């Protein structure tokens, strides 16, 4: 579990770049800062600061990917089958 | 509307001042890149 601190690649010019899909996340268990992947920039819209994100093992050096945001599957949100509860 | 080519530079007083500062600064230490007889 982690807290989304910032969306690092939000300002990158080239769309759907590797940088655009990276988010800097705080691991709640220990407070260490890590970096996580989002499947696509379209999914990045769902992710915003200060929500709970569930991370799973996977620009080298990024070893995590977001699977659930706010307790809802990111894939489900992308497929338009659920709404993110806030 | 977009420009295709670089504009022609304009010689304002500041540009002249900078360039002449360069010239003086070069001649102070006699730093001349000139051709030398072989």
């Amino acid at each position: 579990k982690g807290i989304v601190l910032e969306k690092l690649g939000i300002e990158s010019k080239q769309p759907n770049s590797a940088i655009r899909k990276c988010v800097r996340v705080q691991l709640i268990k220990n407070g260490k800062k890590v970096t996580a992947f989002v499947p696509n920039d379209g999914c990045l819209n769902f992710v915003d600061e200060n929500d709970e994100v569930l991370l799973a093992g996977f620009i080298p050096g990024v070893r995590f990917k977001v699977v659930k945001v706010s307790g809802v599957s990111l894939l489900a949100l992308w497929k338009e089958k659920k709404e993110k509860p806030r | 509307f977009d420009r295709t080519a670089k504009p022609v530079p304009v010689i304002t007083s500041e540009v002249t001042e900078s360039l002449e500062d360069m010239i003086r600064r070069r001649i102070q230490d006699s730093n001349f890149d000139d051709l030398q007889r072989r």
Partner: peptide, 29 residues
């Protein structure tokens, strides 16, 4: 005159963007 100003403005904007792209990629890795 407007042409000169735009080129100067675009130049700084590009330079700041590239510098930021340098800082961000250094941090992530």
């Amino acid at each position: 005159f407007e042409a000169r100003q735009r080129i100067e403005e675009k130049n700084k904007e590009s330079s700041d963007y590239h510098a930021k792209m340098a800082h961000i990629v250094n941090t992530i890795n």
